[PDB]
Amino acid sequence: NDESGIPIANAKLDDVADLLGGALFLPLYKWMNEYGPIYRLAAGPRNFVIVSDPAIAKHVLRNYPKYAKGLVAEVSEFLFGSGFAIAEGPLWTARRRAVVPSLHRRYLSVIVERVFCKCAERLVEKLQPYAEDGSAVNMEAKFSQMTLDVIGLSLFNYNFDSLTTDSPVIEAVYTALKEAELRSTDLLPYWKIDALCKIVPRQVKAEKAVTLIRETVEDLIAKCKEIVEREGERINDEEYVNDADPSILRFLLASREEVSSVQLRDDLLSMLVAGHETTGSVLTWTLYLLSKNSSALRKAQEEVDRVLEGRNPAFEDIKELKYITRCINESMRLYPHPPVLIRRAQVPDILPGNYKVNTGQDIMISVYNIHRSSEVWEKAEEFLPERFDIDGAIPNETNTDFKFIPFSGGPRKCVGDQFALMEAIVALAVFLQRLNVELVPDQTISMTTGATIHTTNGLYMKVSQR
């Protein structure tokens, strides 16, 4: 008896291979069913308390900073620096308070028209050769390109244009994301030694990518700042949008909050990463789930046909795309990004159920387990958008009491939750408006986990014009 009350899972080498190899969800789910809503994984240097229970997850997520960001904030410092997605303390409090006002309703309304619809129409245009010749297209890569192009336009008013062609800065983005994922699974953090970073090929390539990304963002910031200062631009209304530059960067510069240039670069870089692959993966799995579930796809097309009659979605249309919203909600239930949330106890605490943890205890919340647990959800493995009241509030962690956790919760909740849901709704509505879609047969659509749940082998679809 270690007096904590927490059962200890018995992990074998095969389980550890899964934890390091992109199949993290597999042993964690198996151990949830064997040991219950909370258990310990102590594998070598690591010691995690793994939480698979709504009530405990709620306690952990709402009690920030008692449960602090922990290992995650430490492993991705190389990419984000002190950007507020991983910063803590008064810096975090101030930067989040400064950035959240940029995501207001008028800004969202402008972005829907000029960014979400524009990039989704561009996606459809890039699919026209496949619609004509009937061949298969990897929609997971296409959605990744679209959501990258969206986030860059929304943050900087700059189009990476990865839907059209590759570029050095685009390659650098994926190189940086890869490095962040590998660092979370390295057996030995050799990259802490600076001399090894100068000779190990993976590290000298990662360092070049991070430099190019940081330089690109710095140049974008300096160019916008020159305009803002020269023109004497300041925020004078509530819900401010510069009509010529409807970007978050412009809003933040116009607000004239005291912030260093590097902190602003780090802030925007953290939003670039936070808003790209997550949104692309949500759209990927939603499209997969609809292509497996003809009744849902039919109901989704019926809604977009009736609500829009072929028009582009406007901001005011989004609240009427109710079933399409619940399709995305149910996709995020079955496939949460990331599938686990990380915390670390900063003081001793007692979790609901009288489970005791000490200062320093690393915590893993398996959102995948909570969403797929038969103790939490009926028919947990089925794609049923109808499980949500189509006339009720859109489900989230507060109104389901953390049985559904699509955007985390508590003080560190995702700040782009309204933004991202609106991007998925608009892009999926435009897709379903313009294209029929079928899953190519004989594929194995399986999960590989990193910062998001992505497919192991791609998501190949056939499309045709509607």
Ligand X SMILES: CCCCCCCCS[C@@H]1O[C@H](CO)[C@@H](O)[C@H](O)[C@H]1O
Contact call for residue 19 and ligand X (CB under 6 A):
yes
Q: Per-residue b/e over 120-145, b at no fewer than 16 CB within 10 Å?
A: bebbbeebeebbeeeebbbbbebbbb
- Pick from 145, 408, 433, 455 the residue near ligand HEM by CB under 6 A: 408
Select the residue interacting with ligand HEM from 30, 62, 66, 96 (CB under 6 A): 96
- The DSSP annotation for 302-353 comes to HHHHHHHTTPPP-GGGGGG-HHHHHHHHHHHHHS-SSSEEEEEESS-EEETT
Tell me the closest approach of the beta carbon of residue 214 to ligand X, in angstroms: 22
50 binds ligand X, rule: CB under 6 A: no
Give me the least distance between CB of 283 and ligand HEM, in Å please.
8
Q: 408 contacts which partner out of ligand X, ligand HEM, none, CB within 5 to 8 A by kind?
A: ligand HEM
Q: Is 94 in the site for ligand X (CB under 6 A)?
A: no
Contact 455, 446 (CB under 8 A): yes
Q: Does the annotation place 119 within a ligand binding site?
A: no
Handedness of CA 179, 92, 397, 321 (dihedral sign): negative
Q: How far is the CB of 19 from ligand X (least distance, A)?
A: 4
- Number of residues located near ligand X, criterion CB under 6 A: 14
Among 203, 279, 301, 366, binds ligand HEM (CB under 6 A): 279
* Rounded to 5°, angle at Cα 421 from 417 and 422: 115
| Number of residues counted as binding ligand HEM (CB under 6 A) | 20
What does 282 interact with, of ligand HEM, ligand X, none (CB < 5 to 8 A by kind)? ligand HEM
How far, CA to CA in Å, does 141 sit from each of 64, 335, 337, 399, 461? 35, 17, 17, 33, 11
In this structure, are residues 315 and 104 in contact, taking their beta carbons and an 8 Å threshold?
no
Terminal Cα distance for the chain, rounded? 64
Peptide bond into 65 cis (omega under 30): yes
416 binds ligand HEM (CB under 6 A): yes
**φ, ψ for residue 344 (rounded to 5)?**
-150, 130
Q: What are phi and psi of 451, to 5 degrees?
A: -65, -25
Q: Whole-number minimum distance, CB 72 to ligand X, in Å?
A: 5
270 binds ligand HEM (CB under 6 A): yes
67 binds, among ligand HEM, ligand X, none (CB under 5 to 8 A by kind): none
- Residues of this chain, 337-356, that bind ligand HEM according to CB under 6 A: 337, 341
Site string for ligand HEM, 281-310 (x = CB under 6 A): -x----------------------------
For ligand HEM, the closer CB: 32 or 248: 248
Q: Whose Cβ is closer to ligand HEM: residue 422's or residue 435's? A: 422
Closest approach of ligand HEM to the CB of residue 102, in Å: 9
Q: Is 19 in contact with 341 (CB distance < 8 Å)?
A: no
Q: 3-state DSSP call for residue 138?
A: strand
Closer residue to ligand X, CB minimum distance, 56 or 451: 451
CB-based burial, 327-350: b 16+ in 10 Å, e otherwise: bbbbbbbbbbbbbbbbbbbbeebe
AA identity, residue 210: V
Contact of 228 with 253, CB cutoff 8 Å: yes
Q: Binding to ligand X by residue 27, rule CB under 6 A?
A: no
Query: How many H helices and E strands in the chain?
Result: 18, 12
130 binds, among ligand HEM, ligand X, none (CB under 5 to 8 A by kind): none
Number of residues written out for the chain: 466
Closest distance to ligand X from the beta carbon of 367 (Å):
11
Least distance (Å) between residue 282 CB and ligand X: 17
Burial 92-117 (b: 16+ CB within 10 A, else e): bebbbebbebbbeeebbbbbbeebbb
Smallest distance from ligand HEM to CB 275, Å: 3
Partner interacting with residue 206 (select from ligand X, ligand HEM, none; CB below 5-8 Å by kind):
none
- The residues with which 462 forms a beta bridge, in sequence order, are 438
Which residues, numbered 178-217, are part of the site for ligand X (CB under 6 A)?
184-185
Binding window for ligand X (CB under 6 A); candidates: 70-78, 234-242, 288-296, 384-392: 70-78
Helix, strand or coil, per DSSP, at residue 265: helix
| DSSP run (H or E) holding 202 | helix 201-231
DSSP letter for each residue of 67-121: EE-THHHHHTHHHHTT-TTT--HHHHHHHHHHHGGGG-HHHHHHHIIIIIHHHHH
Site for ligand X (CB under 6 A): which residue of 55, 71, 212, 227? 71
The item of ligand X, ligand HEM, none sharing an interface with residue 419, based on CB under 5 to 8 Å by kind, is: ligand HEM
Check residue 223 for interaction with ligand X (CB under 6 A). Answer: no
Name the residues that contact ligand X, by CB under 6 A.
16, 19, 24, 43-44, 46, 71-72, 75, 184-185, 338, 342, 451
Name the residues that contact ligand HEM, by CB under 6 A.
84-85, 96, 270-271, 274-275, 278-279, 282, 337, 341, 407-408, 412, 414-416, 419-420
